[PDB]
Design an enzyme around this catalytic site. Structure first.
Site, PDB file in Angstrom:
ATOM      1  N   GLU A   1      83.882  14.434  92.692  1.00  0.00           N
ATOM      2  CA  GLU A   1      83.109  14.913  91.542  1.00  0.00           C
ATOM      3  C   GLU A   1      82.592  16.331  91.794  1.00  0.00           C
ATOM      4  OE1 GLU A   1      81.241  10.366  90.966  1.00  0.00           O
ATOM      5  OE2 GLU A   1      80.008  12.134  90.481  1.00  0.00           O
TER       6      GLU A   1
ATOM      7  N   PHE B   1      71.199  12.514  80.253  1.00  0.00           N
ATOM      8  CA  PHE B   1      72.115  12.409  81.381  1.00  0.00           C
ATOM      9  C   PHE B   1      73.385  11.588  81.233  1.00  0.00           C
ATOM     10  CE2 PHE B   1      68.868  14.628  83.779  1.00  0.00           C
ATOM     11  CZ  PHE B   1      69.675  15.433  84.577  1.00  0.00           C
TER      12      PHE B   1
ATOM     13  N   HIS C   1      74.001   1.999  93.560  1.00  0.00           N
ATOM     14  CA  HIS C   1      73.188   3.208  93.637  1.00  0.00           C
ATOM     15  C   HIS C   1      71.678   2.990  93.668  1.00  0.00           C
ATOM     16  CE1 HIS C   1      73.293   7.754  92.367  1.00  0.00           C
ATOM     17  NE2 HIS C   1      72.540   7.532  93.429  1.00  0.00           N
TER      18      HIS C   1
ATOM     19  N   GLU D   1      79.233  -0.410  92.731  1.00  0.00           N
ATOM     20  CA  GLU D   1      78.248   0.667  92.792  1.00  0.00           C
ATOM     21  C   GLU D   1      76.860   0.049  92.853  1.00  0.00           C
ATOM     22  OE1 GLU D   1      78.362   4.130  90.301  1.00  0.00           O
ATOM     23  OE2 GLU D   1      76.329   4.665  90.930  1.00  0.00           O
TER      24      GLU D   1
ATOM     25  N   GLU E   1      78.882   5.466  95.030  1.00  0.00           N
ATOM     26  CA  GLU E   1      77.460   5.471  95.352  1.00  0.00           C
ATOM     27  C   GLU E   1      76.867   4.128  95.768  1.00  0.00           C
ATOM     28  OE1 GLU E   1      76.494   7.454  91.526  1.00  0.00           O
ATOM     29  OE2 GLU E   1      75.997   9.203  92.756  1.00  0.00           O
TER      30      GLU E   1
ATOM     31  N   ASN F   1      64.757   4.820  80.505  1.00  0.00           N
ATOM     32  CA  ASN F   1      66.088   5.374  80.288  1.00  0.00           C
ATOM     33  C   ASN F   1      66.178   6.770  80.898  1.00  0.00           C
ATOM     34  OD1 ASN F   1      65.647   7.646  78.217  1.00  0.00           O
ATOM     35  ND2 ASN F   1      64.498   5.928  77.339  1.00  0.00           N
TER      36      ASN F   1
ATOM     37  N   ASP G   1      76.371   4.926  86.530  1.00  0.00           N
ATOM     38  CA  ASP G   1      75.600   5.755  85.610  1.00  0.00           C
ATOM     39  C   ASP G   1      76.297   5.779  84.248  1.00  0.00           C
ATOM     40  OD1 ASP G   1      74.082   7.681  84.311  1.00  0.00           O
ATOM     41  OD2 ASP G   1      75.040   9.355  85.359  1.00  0.00           O
TER      42      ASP G   1
ATOM     43  N   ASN H   1      77.846  14.290  79.933  1.00  0.00           N
ATOM     44  CA  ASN H   1      78.292  15.290  80.910  1.00  0.00           C
ATOM     45  C   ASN H   1      79.766  15.642  80.691  1.00  0.00           C
ATOM     46  OD1 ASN H   1      77.010  12.851  83.195  1.00  0.00           O
ATOM     47  ND2 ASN H   1      75.791  14.380  82.083  1.00  0.00           N
TER      48      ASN H   1
ATOM     49  N   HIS I   1      85.310   7.964  82.165  1.00  0.00           N
ATOM     50  CA  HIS I   1      84.727   6.658  81.894  1.00  0.00           C
ATOM     51  C   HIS I   1      85.436   6.127  80.658  1.00  0.00           C
ATOM     52  CE1 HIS I   1      81.303   5.329  84.271  1.00  0.00           C
ATOM     53  NE2 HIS I   1      80.922   6.585  84.413  1.00  0.00           N
TER      54      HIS I   1
ATOM     55  N   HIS J   1      83.898   4.144  87.248  1.00  0.00           N
ATOM     56  CA  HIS J   1      83.979   3.834  88.671  1.00  0.00           C
ATOM     57  C   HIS J   1      84.345   2.351  88.672  1.00  0.00           C
ATOM     58  CE1 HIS J   1      81.964   7.569  89.752  1.00  0.00           C
ATOM     59  NE2 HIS J   1      80.969   7.269  88.936  1.00  0.00           N
TER      60      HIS J   1
END
Ligand SMILES: [Mg+2]
Ligand SMILES: [Mg+2]
Ligand SMILES: [Mg+2]
Ligand code: NA
Ligand code: NA
Ligand code: NA
Ligand code: NA
Ligand code: NA
Lengths: 1011, 210
Positions: free
Chosen positions: A525, A589, A406, A404, A449, A585, A189, A592, A345, A379
């Site tokens: 998390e 989000f 996801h 990942e 994920e 998109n 993400d 964070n 990140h 990640h």
């Protein structure tokens, strides 16, 4: 061959992975970690050309520079240069899900570099090129000849160029593909970018060389003795004259050293490794490494002849520490850790995903300054410098494989497929091979994920086999599968269970004791810090401290992934998902963080610093009990400052040196505090100060604080009666009161105070009216969208109930003349389609002293969603420079996020009473306020409030902060009550019951007057 | 000094309204110079004979949280029944009322008293919106107990068989009441969420003739 559409081919002619090499030819430069002449950087200006697909690239490009190409800096992401748009998508893959295929229109970045190579480098030895990071796949050519191919955007790809180079001028051609089968394992993400985003360099090694080396440290029961074991591997021609010496250094003092010819012990029927040797050095009373005290030694590995002639030397920093899980607890050097971590990140607002030392150092300093002691590489493996810095500054690290998936359905579709095991194993194994010598890395992670598949179990066991010094964790498939040594859920709540089918998120307290469970629990998390968030953060820490097996977690996350864009006037602004034309998109989000992209702190960071303090306090009489949560260090750079004040007025203060052993306690007896004459509440405030500067903080740094209410003297003295008497005046449309140069006007049609005058000067731009709504926070909205509504989200429940549409209906508006005052009584009913949502009953009492006492009593229909707030609001005509208040502060604080705030007298410029969240919403509130001062106004009582040049309406109608415009006057929101902000996650209601306005009936009173 | 505290009058005024009379009072309960509580009330009597009582109490943050915040008086009347709309029918307290149901309850006065061998506060009923006794009717949102025994007699008597019905009926109407606890009976056991620690409380009642 279309190697980028085959998970079976993840590389071609790539060299084996290994720890950081520099090939020093001088043991002293290796010991000191100074630059090496054998390691050159190729960073700088390169030639770049963008193509819509690899088939569009001209063959001539392999032979010579394309005149159309531009000159750009490398490392870099080509989206940051404007060649194409960066894409922000969360779960859904940015490309059609059809493994192993990718779009035919595959953005292709053609990089090239003409550079010089000294003949000496070619006259002997091996010359290799190293690409630390190329997103997502690439082919390499040297002087027109094809060299190799490589995948995995987060680990270095190395190739031997010895046979491709010429003395003098040389040209590299690198064709980088944006999409590849590797992309199916890179669905994190975050912004989807590409290019050569990490360093590029040339390393020269002798033909006979150190090809790999592993360092381990084992200890005795009390850690008073240790054995450093170093396995060294070589390549080239093996001879008896060859030797390896591993020496350990503490500064310029050599503490130990071992020497031996090659030839390991027998391992099986065919013998042993002739090309390997293991040195074992004894170390007495080693200085142990921890995030508390990052003690480091230097290990130098010398490949030399029996006679002492050096061939080459490699080295690394060594941290003597043991990581193990025993009896359900994660121990570091025999002590149970309490992880104060955060996910981080690699993100830069201007450079995208390119990392630099300055930014890394900045993050580490801010992290340690805010009481964090651990970081998770979410990640993927990070830039190599990151681990070096964590080793030296002292931070526990969770190194995570770049895997990942996801967006797959189900999430383990690929990870449970044996055909994808090869691609997956390379991402795990090459990570371990590269970072296994870093002491800061204490835990390995299999990725993120990607559900739980058999591939995870296989790779989990592989690591346990090659490196038993570190626990392995993985959250996929339920957070407690057979592929994890640690129960590591994401967003599991403290007390509330979330029984999802197959992958439930149990209350963390409950998870620990499930039948048969014995593992430690550390959230990979938690506390999603999206926008105005972190409500309920203290609930986690209270639990972490009470439960031994609840050993913390990593907040999500460190920094907002917002990107910089410029307007018509060239003014920069923070952008998020969709602002680059990228679609589909996931908008906001990508933001964070606890800090803005430019590392400016969000208010929530202070709440984290406070809850993560290393000193705990208790008050009993005149005694302050200080308890240390440090596991290894004594408080030898800490001083305790104490202060007693009456309603912001300091009465006494002092300081006491702190002498607390790790896990120890210290009792501090406060001197006889004098009783204040005036009435009011006495407050005690203590704070830990670090007199001396450190590598991560400045002198005077405050590391912890706490407050206590002491004695309180209720005011029983009546105010001196004023001989003046307010005069009431009436008309069909108004009730006006006059006292001296002050006037109050109550509209009889609306029932609200519509205007006030001080010296015949209007005070209001908008009438004083009740307010039960707020510009929705990210947590109030969740994943709800205009075209995809989430009926369960708080904002949707409020809208559906009509809270934002509700119209005030006057039920009563009377006026009465009292002996020494005027009493106005009103009653309103807010309805929506015949439904009475709220009923507000007020009384305004204006006396001879000009003070206006407002009493409010609200009824909330039990069957309407609990209101975001219960208060009053109005637009003041005045615009002052300062805001002075006696309450919780100085920073923004909400009911479920105010433990860090202190009660005192605060004074700030109006602009600081507004929090510039990229996505606008309710903000800047300050709770537990007894007095507020702005311009000529003063409000007294016990309320929460926010004050700014932006109305709640503008805030909820604006998508970006840069589009906000100061309105006329100043908007004031004074609440008797305000709902919590929540944050356990940002995609489902997360405001705890105790912070919801569900009482049904509320009461609060205010006193408005002229300062 | 909670049991010794004496009420000190700080203010008492009256006013005429277009349709009612307004009485305003303010008291300070002190003990050896320490102000424990401050009670501010307003009584509003209208043409319908209904008296609206508004109470606002301040509790010193440094005094132990009070067992209750309410009003009490000895009624001259002695009726046979007690009718109320609230939690019941049996005795229930803030931290022991899940079993109680909200409805209209009617019981003989004697059932509003729990004969615990060792006398103490008892018979409370919470979440009551309406209470009826004799010609009286109280409306609002309060907790209450009503019996022939004063809180004073209850705390001065060691055995229930030594209790004696006093003249009239003692009525305790609370806006708030502390939990009773019980995790054990030899150390404070009332959970924090059931302690009256807000510092400031508000409740309102309406007294009239049923
Ligand atoms: Mg491939
Ligand atoms: Mg994801
Ligand atoms: Mg506190
Ligand atoms: Na713990
Ligand atoms: Na995100
Ligand atoms: Na010290
Ligand atoms: Na908005
Ligand atoms: Na008794």
């Amino acid at each position: 061959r279309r190697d980028w559409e085959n998970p079976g081919v993840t590389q071609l002619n790539r060299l084996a992975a290994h720890p950081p090499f520099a090939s020093w030819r001088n043991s002293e430069e290796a010991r000191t970690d100074r630059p090496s002449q054998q390691l050159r950087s190729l960073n700088g200006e390169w030639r770049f050309a963008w193509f819509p697909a690899p088939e569009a690239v001209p063959e001539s490009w392999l032979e010579c520079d394309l005149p159309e190409a531009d000159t750009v800096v490398v490392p870099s992401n080509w989206q940051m240069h404007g060649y194409d748009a960066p894409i922000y998508t969360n779960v859904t893959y940015p490309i059609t899900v059809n493994p192993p295929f990718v779009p035919t229109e595959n953005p292709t970045g053609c990089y090239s570099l003409t550079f010089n190579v000294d003949e000496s480098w070619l006259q002997e030895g091996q010359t290799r090129i190293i690409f630390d990071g190329v997103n997502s796949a690439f082919h390499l050519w040297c002087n027109g000849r094809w060299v190799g191919y490589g995948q995995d955007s987060r680990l270095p790809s190395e190739f031997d160029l010895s046979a491709f180079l010429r003395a003098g001028e040389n040209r590299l051609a690198v064709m980088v593909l944006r999409w590849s089968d590797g992309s199916y394992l890179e669905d994190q993400d975050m912004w989807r970018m590409s290019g050569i985003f990490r360093d590029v360099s040339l390393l020269h090694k002798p033909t006979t060389q150190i090809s790999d080396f592993h360092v381990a440290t084992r200890f005795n029961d009390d850690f008073s003795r240790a054995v450093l074991e170093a396995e060294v591997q070589m390549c080239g021609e093996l001879r008896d004259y060859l030797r390896v010496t591993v020496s350990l250094w503490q500064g310029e003092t050599q503490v130990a050293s071992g020497t031996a010819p090659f030839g390991g012990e027998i391992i099986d029927e065919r013998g042993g490794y002739a090309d390997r040797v293991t040195l074992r050095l004894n170390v007495e009373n080693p200085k142990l490494w921890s995030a508390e005290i990052p003690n480091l030694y230097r290990a130098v590995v010398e490949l030399h002849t029996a006679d002492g002639t050096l061939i080459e030397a490699e080295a690394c920093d060594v941290g003597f520490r043991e990581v193990r899980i025993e009896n359900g607890l994660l121990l570091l050097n025999g002590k149970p850790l309490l992880i104060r971590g955060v996910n981080r990140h690699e993100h830069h607002p201007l450079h995208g995903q390119v990392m630099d030392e300055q930014t890394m150092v900045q993050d580490i300093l801010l992290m340690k300054q805010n009481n964090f002691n651990a970081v998770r590489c979410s990640h993927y493996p990070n830039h190599p410098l990151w681990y070096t810095l964590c080793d030296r500054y002292g931070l526990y690290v969770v190194d995570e494989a770049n895997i990942e998936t996801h967006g797959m359905v189900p999430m383990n579709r690929l990870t449970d497929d044996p055909r994808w095991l090869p691609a997956m194993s390379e991402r795990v194994t090459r990570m371990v091979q590269r970072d296994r010598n870093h002491p800061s890395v204490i835990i390995w992670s299999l990725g993120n994920e990607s559900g739980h598949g058999a591939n995870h179990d296989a790779l989990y066991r592989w690591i346990k086999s090659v490196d038993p010094s570190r626990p392995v964790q993985y959250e996929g498939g339920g957070a407690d599968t057979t592929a994890t040594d640690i129960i590591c859920p994401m967003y599991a709540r403290v007390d509330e269970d979330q029984p999802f089918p197959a992958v439930p998120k149990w209350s963390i307290k409950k998870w620990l004791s499930l039948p048969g469970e014995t593992r430690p629990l550390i959230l990979c998390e938690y506390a999603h810090a999206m926008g105005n968030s972190l409500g309920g953060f203290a609930k986690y820490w209270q639990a972490f401290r009470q439960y031994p097996r609840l050993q913390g977690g990593f907040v999500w996350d460190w920094v907002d992934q917002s990107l910089i864009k410029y307007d018509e006037n060239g003014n920069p602004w923070s952008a998020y998902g969709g602002d680059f034309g990228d679609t589909p998109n996931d908008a906001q989000f990508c933001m964070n963080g606890l800090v803005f992209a430019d590392r400016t702190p969000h208010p929530a960071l202070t709440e984290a610093k406070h809850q993560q303090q290393f000193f705990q306090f208790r008050l009993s009489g005149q005694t302050i009990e200080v308890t240390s949560e440090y596991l290894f260090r004594h408080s030898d750079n800490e001083l305790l400052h104490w202060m007693v004040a009456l309603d912001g007025k300091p009465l006494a203060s002092g300081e006491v040196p702190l002498d607390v052993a790790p896990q120890g306690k210290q009792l501090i007896e406060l001197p006889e505090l004098p009783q204040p004459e005036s009435a009011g509440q006495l407050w005690l405030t203590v704070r830990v100060v670090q007199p001396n500067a450190t590598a991560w903080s400045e002198a005077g740094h405050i590391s912890a604080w706490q407050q206590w209410r002491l004695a309180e003297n209720l005011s029983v003295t009546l105010p001196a009666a004023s001989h003046a008497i307010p005069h009431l005046t009436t008309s069909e449309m108004d009730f006006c009161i006059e006292l001296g140069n002050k006037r109050w006007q109550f509209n009889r049609q609306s029932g609200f105070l519509s205007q006030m005058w001080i010296g015949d000067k209007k005070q209001l731009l908008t009438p004083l009216r009740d307010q039960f709504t707020r510009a929705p926070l990210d947590n109030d909205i969740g994943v709800s969208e205009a075209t995809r509504i989430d009926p369960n989200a708080w904002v949707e429940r409020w809208k559906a109930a009509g809270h934002y549409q509700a119209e005030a209906a006057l039920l009563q508006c009377t006026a009465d003349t009292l002996a020494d005052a005027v009493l106005i009584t009103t009653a309103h009913a807010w309805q929506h389609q015949g439904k009475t949502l709220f009923i507000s009953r007020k009384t305004y009492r204006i006396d001879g002293s000009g003070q206006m006492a407002i009493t409010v009593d609200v009824e909330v229909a039990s069957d309407t969603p609990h209101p975001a707030r219960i208060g009053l609001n109005c637009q003041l005509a005045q615009v002052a420079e300062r805001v002075n208040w006696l309450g919780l502060g100085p920073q923004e604080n909400y009911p479920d996020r105010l433990t860090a705030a202190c009660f005192d007298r605060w004074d700030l410029p109006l602009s600081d009473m507004y929090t510039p969240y990229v996505f606008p919403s309710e903000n800047g509130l300050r709770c537990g306020t007894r007095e507020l001062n702005y311009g000529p106004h003063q409000w007294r009582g016990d309320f929460q409030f926010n004050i700014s040049r932006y109305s709640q309406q503008q805030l909820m109608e604006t998508s970006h902060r840069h589009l906000l415009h100061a309105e006329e006057g100043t908007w004031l929101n004074i609440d008797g009550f305000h709902m919590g902000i929540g944050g356990d996650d940002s995609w489902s209601p997360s405001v705890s019951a105790e912070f919801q306005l569900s009482a049904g009936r509320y009461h609060y009173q205010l006193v408005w007057c002229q300062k």
